[PDB]
Amino acid sequence: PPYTVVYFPVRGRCAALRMLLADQGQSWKEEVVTVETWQEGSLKASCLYGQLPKFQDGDLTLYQSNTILRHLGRTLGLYGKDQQEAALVDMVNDGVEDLRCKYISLIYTNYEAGKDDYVKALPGQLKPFETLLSQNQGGKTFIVGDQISFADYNLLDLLLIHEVLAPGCLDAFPLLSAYVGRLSARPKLKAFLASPEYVNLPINGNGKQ
Amino acid sequence: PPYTVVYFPVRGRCAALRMLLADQGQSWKEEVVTVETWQEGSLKASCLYGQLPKFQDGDLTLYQSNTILRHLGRTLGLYGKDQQEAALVDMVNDGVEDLRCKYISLIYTNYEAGKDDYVKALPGQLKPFETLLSQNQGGKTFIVGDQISFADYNLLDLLLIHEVLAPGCLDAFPLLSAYVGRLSARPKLKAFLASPEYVNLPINGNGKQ
Ligand SMILES: N[C@@H](CCC(=O)N[C@@H](CS)C(=O)NCC(=O)O)C(=O)O
Ligand SMILES: N[C@@H](CCC(=O)N[C@@H](CS)C(=O)NCC(=O)O)C(=O)O
Helix, strand or coil, X not given: CCEEEEECCCCHHHHHHHHHHHHCCCCEEEEECCHHHHHCCHHHHHCCCCCCCEEEECCEEEECHHHHHHHHHHXXXXXXXXXXXXXXXXXXXXXXXXHHHHHHHHHHHCHHHHHHHHHHHHHHHHHHHHHHHHCCHHHCCCCCCCCCCHHHHHHHHHHHHHHHXXXXXXXXXXXXXXXXXXXXXXXXXXXXHCCHHHHCCCCCCCCCC | CCEEEEECCCCHHHHHHHHHHHHCCCXXXXXXXXXXXXXXXXXXXXXXXXXXXXXXXXXXXXXXXXXXXXXXXXXXXXXXXXXHHHHHHHHHHHHXXXXXXXXXXXXXXXXXXXXXXXXXXXXHHHHHHHHHHHCCHHHCCCCXXXXXXXXXXXXXXXXXXXXXXXXXXXXXXXXXXXXXXXXXXXXXXXXXXXXXXXXXXXCCCCCCC
């Protein structure tokens, strides 16, 4: 640290890393980028891949949400207990990322027309995570191992936003359902999820969810 | 080890991890999955996210190409010299992944119609990596630090396939151009890139490139 999150006034790709920081008792600064500032071009041009989030950790400047998650993950000890667990954490996170990309595609590309189809395919997309849970202490702890990892936060956010998109989409998945309520119940996390900082921010930037 | 790569008879998302194995002097088994075997459904159903590559490392079974790259990366010591370098390696790899996704989209979704546009935007997509290089020992070594990492292999493959898509797309990028020739010149890598094992495999599965 100190940590600084440079992003638009949305939860989006910063929601999970924010939950991580909050739950780990970390302090950070939120640098909010309005549309006007982005449309002007200066900031965008300075970003490596021309996109936000931009993360500051002392003298270290990072880009890419998953790079930030892995950074906070290895640095804060939320990346598995060993190399094998670390690989499992990656496999989970990679899966979460694939579905997030499909979700964002729906939201920004063809929400109205493609929504029903997306919802039909959803259970097949959630299945893998339910399976992962059933293989780890009967799904009573975390997604990988007995300790929480950055993949847990990313998975939790994914499940939360999909529940807003299709309420009750977790009803057919017992372990996933229980996993969300359990994680969401974590003191520092519960406090964050209920805060104006989280609640008063739209999930996405186009008003859809 | 032992390592086993279960994949279709294409370079695709296994090309980079194969270059890594080869260049590091590693031995592995190639389990080739024909269309008939995949269309039958048994293997697909057993895959976590229903897709290949599937990787075997002794008793460890992994899925997701980047999970395999990171696995081989941390296990073989190709993941930066410290935590900061490791995060930079992720940032590079995340960027390579974003562009690979755009490329695959072109190849399978609308190659014919969207090709020219993709090629127009290409330099803006390659720029970040040229910049990364200019900031690391003047681009004379690797993408991050003085040692090679899994991100190097993934970046090299990306550059190779784009050069096949748009020959000379690296002509405006001196460091990227030099970086490819240098890496491609590496003994074990050069030997692999020239082999029937690599050469006689199509870049993609739809005959396009
Ligand atoms: N792969 C990147 C995606 C970043 C991204 O898509 N950023 C968007 C907002 S969520 C952005 O900055 N859009 C502005 C633009 O591209 O003009 C990540 O993982 O962070
Ligand atoms: N995100 C995955 C992508 C895997 C993937 O797209 N696999 C394709 C081949 S490149 C596949 O198995 N397609 C068969 C299917 O989905 O039916 C990774 O990084 O490996």
